[PDB]
Amino acid sequence: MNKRVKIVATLGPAVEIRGGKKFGEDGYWGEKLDVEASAKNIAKLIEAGANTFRFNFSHGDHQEQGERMATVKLAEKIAGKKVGFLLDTKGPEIRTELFEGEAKEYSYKTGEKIRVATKQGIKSTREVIALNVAGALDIYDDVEVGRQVLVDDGKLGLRVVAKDDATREFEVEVENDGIIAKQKGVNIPNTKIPFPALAERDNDDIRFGLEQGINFIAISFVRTAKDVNEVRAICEETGNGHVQLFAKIENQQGIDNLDEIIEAADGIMIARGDMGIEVPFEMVPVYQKMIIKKVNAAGKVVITATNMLETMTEKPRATRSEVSDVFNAVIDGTDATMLSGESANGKYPLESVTTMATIDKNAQALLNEYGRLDSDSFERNSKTEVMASAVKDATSSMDIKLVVTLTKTGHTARLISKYRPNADILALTFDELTERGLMLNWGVIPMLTDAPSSTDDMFEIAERKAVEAGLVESGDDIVIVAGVPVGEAVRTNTMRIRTVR
Amino acid sequence: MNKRVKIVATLGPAVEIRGGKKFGEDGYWGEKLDVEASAKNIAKLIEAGANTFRFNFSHGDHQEQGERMATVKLAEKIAGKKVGFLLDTKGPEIRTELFEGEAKEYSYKTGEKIRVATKQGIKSTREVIALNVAGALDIYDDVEVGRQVLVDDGKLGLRVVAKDDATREFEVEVENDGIIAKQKGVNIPNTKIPFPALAERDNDDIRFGLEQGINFIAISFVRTAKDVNEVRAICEETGNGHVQLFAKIENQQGIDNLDEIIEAADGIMIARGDMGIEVPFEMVPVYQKMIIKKVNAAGKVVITATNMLETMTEKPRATRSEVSDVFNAVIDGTDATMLSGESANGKYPLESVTTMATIDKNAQALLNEYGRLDSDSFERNSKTEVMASAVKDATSSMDIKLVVTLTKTGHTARLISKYRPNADILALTFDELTERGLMLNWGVIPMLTDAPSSTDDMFEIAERKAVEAGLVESGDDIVIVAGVPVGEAVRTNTMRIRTVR
Amino acid sequence: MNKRVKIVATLGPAVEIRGGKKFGEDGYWGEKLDVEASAKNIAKLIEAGANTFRFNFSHGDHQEQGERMATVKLAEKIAGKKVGFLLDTKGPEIRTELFEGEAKEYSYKTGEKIRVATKQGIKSTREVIALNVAGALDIYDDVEVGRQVLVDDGKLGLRVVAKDDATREFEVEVENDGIIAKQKGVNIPNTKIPFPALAERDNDDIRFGLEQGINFIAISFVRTAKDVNEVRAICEETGNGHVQLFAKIENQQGIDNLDEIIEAADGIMIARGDMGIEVPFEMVPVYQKMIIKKVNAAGKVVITATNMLETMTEKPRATRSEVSDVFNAVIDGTDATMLSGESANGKYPLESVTTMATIDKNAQALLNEYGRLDSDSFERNSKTEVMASAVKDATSSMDIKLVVTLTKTGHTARLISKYRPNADILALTFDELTERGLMLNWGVIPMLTDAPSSTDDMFEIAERKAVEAGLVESGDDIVIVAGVPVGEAVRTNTMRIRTVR
Amino acid sequence: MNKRVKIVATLGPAVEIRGGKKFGEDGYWGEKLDVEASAKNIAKLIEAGANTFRFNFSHGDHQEQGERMATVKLAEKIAGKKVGFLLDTKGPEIRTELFEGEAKEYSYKTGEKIRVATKQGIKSTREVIALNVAGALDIYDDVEVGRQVLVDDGKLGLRVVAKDDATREFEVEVENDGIIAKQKGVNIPNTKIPFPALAERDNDDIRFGLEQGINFIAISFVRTAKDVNEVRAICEETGNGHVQLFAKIENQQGIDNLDEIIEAADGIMIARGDMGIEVPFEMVPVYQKMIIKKVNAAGKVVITATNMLETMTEKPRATRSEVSDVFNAVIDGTDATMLSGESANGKYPLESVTTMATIDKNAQALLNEYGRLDSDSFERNSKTEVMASAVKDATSSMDIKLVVTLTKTGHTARLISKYRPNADILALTFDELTERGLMLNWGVIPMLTDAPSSTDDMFEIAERKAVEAGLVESGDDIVIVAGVPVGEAVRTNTMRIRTVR
Ligand SMILES: O=P(O)(O)OC[C@H]1O[C@](O)(COP(=O)(O)O)[C@@H](O)[C@@H]1O
Ligand SMILES: O=P(O)(O)OC[C@H]1O[C@](O)(COP(=O)(O)O)[C@@H](O)[C@@H]1O
Ligand SMILES: [Mg+2]
Ligand SMILES: [Mg+2]
Ligand SMILES: [Mg+2]
Ligand SMILES: [Mg+2]
């Protein structure tokens, strides 16, 4: 039984061995990276069902990101399985500054009046919190009285009660006991700081990633189509037009501009972490269901992200609410589920991937009964999509073990995936860029093969590659689609129902 | 635009020329048949949309039926289009006898006192009507005072007021003004006459038709599966197992046994004339809709019959009730609509076929809006039926001008027909008997062609035959299904969507 | 079992006895009307299920119409049941003129060239057919070359090949053998003769009918809302605001303006006779289904008319197509079915009503399975309509024998009727005008009772009136709605489920 | 706007003040309970939306449970709002023992070797954990080498590596860093311990609760209908047949016997903590959705429990997975959501109830869009249920602010709740036991009132009580149901739609 829901696993120090030590043992950052022992840990995540690795450029310099990517290339050869490479941009982050005295945090009590400095390049005091704003912007004129400054996952609340025009400080009232640590995430909901459509830092991170070799870019805090189009222009300019863009929807503007963002992007990452601080937390499930339905209707990819197995950062078993979240993401229609801290920073990265895969594989068997997606309502807007509808109809009419598409660009695999057939989809393609580019599409098993000649029987090929990969055996029924014959067919034009020999 | 609902037309003197005279002209019957002039009249009915001719063996002898079948074979050569040949049996029925001195009929007024004889083997007079009871049964002890004897599909009622033991005659009162003609159907509701299992006359009639060459037998007053199986045994014994059997349901016993009759038969004829006298008339629309649904679910053929354009026997225009009836039969899901007196006996046989074709062609355009049949409900019970579902799905997803099937036995064409796709179905077949056997399946346009060899491109043949038939032109989209390749495929296994070159 | 579909029966000479003779016996028009013997025949139609009588002012002068209406008032007291009184207007009829020589018709052959005179007040010749146009209009400039003049139910076709500007004659080619008799209906499709919105003759007929006492006006050839509003103004002006207007839809303009006509009228009569000559005959069933759905959605009354049991003009049993038409009108959603010639002019007026009632009563039992109307899709646009939806829900949830509404104006009965509950609707009302005005609403049994006082138990009343009328017995469950309490309630506000004692 | 999904909150030390100290402060446990200060804390939970308090008899003795129930009775008087009292039994379970020297817990590191004792009636030490096995069973021979002993809802794993016959001790290896605290649940998957039919301790616990005054019993680890019927027998014997029984489903035997457990019980608690260790964790979402559907179909109460806001035990904000879990439980169709450690043991008990109330209130607004429950599918099995269907239909047809039922036993309110109308349900009842018994039914706001006399207007009382409760104001539309009149009606038989004066 193959996992149809794809897993994005964030890499980090959790899987990295340094001079024979695990993450957190003292002196770990003293030692050098053991590339081979790190690659063996990553290979186990691949074997357990990670389909794509996320390189979070919020954390770690270009040297760290570049070595981690090179480590995954070894892991793929140990696992005998390729994975997608996804770069996630820093974007317009605000962080608390370093503290004076090297005193790494202070604790505060409800009611207690302090100040937030807008002035950049300074250090924090306990009385006056300083912010590291992306691109060193001045945020003073953008934040009115009665907004909230939220530190570390919205855990510590600061109410802006007055502004000191003379020092450009917010006069803030602590709303609840809590810590302000150095370098923690800050959110200020319901404000419109003029961050550029694409900051220089993100331009540089993307160009670096494109040079290493990536398949996907997840763009943090996408507010408009313009934030996607500016990254598109760089991919185009550098000969990386094959790279797919996922817009991260994590604030109100992104939700408000969702339709134009979906049209410009290849896919959406539902970035629930920031989204649930930036909009009312109880609205996130409403927006999750609505985004998955819209992205599927567009024939594009949706990733559900953040806190999916959060408890597994510290414990070997997830909570009942975490298992419920992963299961309900699948039923809602998600193409992919994601791990952040659980695979990057936690004690149980392999078990986190294994647990998510178990949940995902169980949930896919209930899509027939409880699935929210309804392919019956779609307009079939092309002949390939007409063939994708007919494939879904065959897999509803009888027990089909596997759909096989011979796909030059993956267009036929994406359309079949959009219809969510009751079968795995083997996408036989003729280059590695197309192969890796399909790795986050629901149900698609990408596989590299030789371009078939005008004299080759593609139905025989389809069956032999399915049997070689161990996906079918004697007596199984499969559906095969292709453009026949090669050199004359302009598109996928043929469906065959075949019993494996 | 092509007619998908098939037309059965009953042949009779209405279309026949005798010594230059038309049916109805003085001295008509004193002339002999003009075969060529009659064949040109029948060729016009073929051209207007008659798909099959009904030869009712309840009227006229073997020589008359045999010459009429020969006239139709000539009409096919004149029209350049083949039709089906359907034999309709007498069955376990009562008919009025020939009259003394070959008077054809008499007229009667309400209140006249006449007699009906039970003695077999004699002729009627105006005052004493004799019955031809199948099996030459004596029915005198089976009919009580107060029963009603109905002649000509219930057009004339005779009340049994007394019985004469001396002559074994019913003394009857004429209930309403009307005609008693020779060889007219007689119904005596609420009576149990013990008709034999298969009358000797039905045995002779079926063996004579099978010798002449027929494609269908319509079995009158089918009571049980055994009434079908007995005719099947004759078809198999004489080397005519290709012949298809339609059970006529026209009494309560046929309705009580419908399920076992459908399993034994190739189709049902809803014989509403007898049915609406033998069962409460107000139940016939209920039974019509339920029969159409069950036969379609079984992948078999249903023919709706009797009174469909009754007024056009005498007048050039149908009533509003008749147009409604033909329209609602199509919407109910009928494969075929029938003409009886309108084509066999009326003044407007060509206009009747033309009018029926016009109503049928309009009603097929309303099948998506109003159609009663629901193919989404069917179990797909075989790999050919899975392909038929997928074809229907293709015709629902985009504008398909034509479905082409390359079919050895017609099985693939019968299963595509069952699903009622939004397209015409070109059935390319390799023998005339399979070709004519498909002529009453909804939407099917049968065409004879050479059996493809293993080196032939069946998709090229399909398009070429469709373009040669004038069914499609450059730029139309067609669906083609075939068992690929010839000499290896077990069944239809391939669907191709093709733009006509 | 009560008939929920209402019957409109046209009265005429068929039920009228003159000096002890039936219609058609020689000297019948010599004798005087036997009022009492005529009233006894009409009472039998009432008992057999006629709910409303149609007085067709196309045929018979004011004296004939006035005596027939007075005859029905006696019939109601013999039957012990009231009926609606419907006036049907002549409207813009064109008829063939009287012939010179008193020679009542001529027969014609295909190809034969003749002339149609537009000049009014003259007599017809065999060579030159003259027309009696409503209001003596000149139709010459309105009819182009290549229109068709159709005589007697579209039976004889005349193609206009040229116009003689000098004599104002059409030069016409007979298209098919046929008779032109004196005073037959003429149609000229696809022309726009400027007949007034309301002719003086129709103004006079309506004022006469209003003076005798009518409940309904069916307005012939309604083209726009203006043709309904002009009759509305007369009903209002004369103190007859209670009179309900049915627009007859019988031509293309009426179909084109259907939405504005439904908004201005109380109901639609689908006048299929003219409609099927004025538009293509095969489109009439499409328009019938669409009109019934739209009129029901508006909460108004739809009557399906013409040819429903046509054969029963001359024979005691209807055809299978006639039974199918009446059954399918019921399933389509019609409130009422109508008889014209069958009850007015035929040999079997009582049996025609009885047959139609039998068909209607059988069909209502299949509305659950096959009914085209869908009340689930309606907007509930008021609190009374919300109560009508809840009543329908109760009758779907359990077996309810009867809904009882205490209704001052009938508004609650019409809304409950609109939802088509699975029960009869007893409408207890407090005046005869409201009572008769409900007689064509699906399922409504109108019954006159005393206005309940603020101290009366309306639920006890509802049950006693149901038991007195023989509609329920001991152990039956009924739904009762009322405005409680009387004098305080502004509308129907209460639903009760009650077991009969 | 009112919360329709009910909240069960587990009470514990988190809300209790002891000698002026809060839970967590130094010397807390050296103080005695401050009853009034604790009652004010609990009153805040009632005000935030706690509808019922859970007293878990697996923790603390009779005196502690008895005083806590007394503190809640005071909290009700302070809040001016009544709550439900639910007793949660030990059942056939294993718990960790008290520690020697009333240490409350110890911390353990991965790889530590410790022992688990099987001997009953002793205390734990850090190195030797003792079990309290219901029925004082010896489990030494029931647990093989290689089994896993899990403590605290699977937070800490112990691998059985060897068995010591000399002490009847399991030698175990600590699988992961964690705490072993006193009276924590112990699970040993894939083991068959023969627990008795009803432990003596459950008998004493149930009889003590029934003496104190409770409304609900939640029966832990219900295996069969007999586990419910044994508690029912005690409730009936002691004169407490009003008490409602929720079966907790938390093992495979409870799932295998679900149908017979639902028929025996008044409700189900989906006890996901134990369930997700006793059955594959990935099956718990499948069982949750199926249990919710079956219990709703039975017109009974379903409570979703455990880990719903787990992170808010320690942090002021829930994860995205937790908000999703609460949201999806509401959408699945749950009557009620539960807090355990969040309210009993955490730092943010008030904020947990507030957060749950906010998610629940938002999710109820999405029930028409996304709701899994389908009331259209139910058989209406009684005249009260027919009225509940009609109420739901009224709330679907227009904007109803409130449904008021005048209900002696709560039956009408339970059936309206079952149908999930788009409105709040005010249940006016005449005794406190019926009033508190309705506190966990979806949408029901119970309120005590005088039994109407035969001279009272129940529709006036309904509106007045609703306006006095502040649930509606002038101009709102309400539906009221009642058995009219008092002293004659058998059941609810009347629905009124009323505009509030
Ligand atoms: O798919 P099914 O229903 O088992 O039909 C299989 C049978 O159909 C056939 O293909 C006949 O099909 P055609 O006559 O349409 O070519 C046989 O060869 C075969 O045995
Ligand atoms: O309609 P059902 O389901 O038979 O219920 C009838 C029973 O309901 C009751 O009315 C209880 O209803 P209430 O407690 O809601 O008033 C009983 O008097 C009666 O016996
Ligand atoms: Mg983010
Ligand atoms: Mg017959
Ligand atoms: Mg007319
Ligand atoms: Mg438990």
PDB file of C-alpha atoms and ligand atoms in Angstrom, chain A residues 54 58 88 90 93 187 220-221 248 250 271-275 306, ligand 3:
ATOM      1  CA  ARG A  54      12.515  21.873   3.143  1.00  0.00           C
ATOM      2  CA  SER A  58      15.114  31.699   8.172  1.00  0.00           C
ATOM      3  CA  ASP A  88      11.641  28.382   2.103  1.00  0.00           C
ATOM      4  CA  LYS A  90      13.076  34.223   5.260  1.00  0.00           C
ATOM      5  CA  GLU A  93      10.405  38.514   9.595  1.00  0.00           C
ATOM      6  CA  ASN A 187       4.049  39.498  14.948  1.00  0.00           C
ATOM      7  CA  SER A 220       7.057  33.493   2.995  1.00  0.00           C
ATOM      8  CA  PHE A 221       4.255  36.075   3.651  1.00  0.00           C
ATOM      9  CA  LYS A 248       2.846  30.846   1.759  1.00  0.00           C
ATOM     10  CA  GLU A 250       0.179  33.519   6.502  1.00  0.00           C
ATOM     11  CA  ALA A 271       1.523  28.398   6.781  1.00  0.00           C
ATOM     12  CA  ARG A 272      -0.717  27.973   9.816  1.00  0.00           C
ATOM     13  CA  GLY A 273       1.951  29.149  12.368  1.00  0.00           C
ATOM     14  CA  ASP A 274       1.944  32.812  11.344  1.00  0.00           C
ATOM     15  CA  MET A 275      -1.601  32.604   9.930  1.00  0.00           C
ATOM     16  CA  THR A 306       2.903  23.708  11.065  1.00  0.00           C
TER      17      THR A 306
HETATM   18 MG    MG E   3       5.644  31.629   8.777  1.00  0.00          MG
END
